[PDB]
Design a binder for these strands. Structure first.
Length: 95
RNA sequence: AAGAAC
């Protein structure tokens, strides 16, 4: 057997900023994404105990009829020279 | 190097 996920493979509105360079936060990411459309919510997650931060984020929009472009434009954008990840995440919403 | 929640 084999696998390729860790949670419910049913995304639909969970955009995000995976590997957000670990030098940026949701108060900065909410502004640059607000340029492409309205924003419903934003999140950045870490670990519960140790092994340092998981260092990544999720983003949500009130309409996907326009958030679809926020995904295609902001993907691989420059933020720390890392060409960050921006698109659907998986598992829709928090735990 | 990307990654898992609350």
């Amino acid at each position: 057997r084999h696998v390729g996920n860790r949670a419910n493979p049913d995304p639909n509105c969970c955009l995000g900023v995976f590997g957000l360079s670990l030098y940026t936060t949701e108060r900065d990411l909410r502004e640059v994404f607000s340029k492409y459309g309205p924003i419903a919510d934003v999140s950045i997650v870490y670990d519960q105990q140790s092994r340092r931060s998981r260092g990544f984020a999720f983003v949500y929009f009130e309409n996907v009829d326009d958030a679809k472009e926020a995904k295609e434009r902001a993907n691989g954008m420059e933020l720390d020279g890392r060409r960050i990840r921006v698109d659907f995440s998986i598992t829709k919403r928090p735990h």
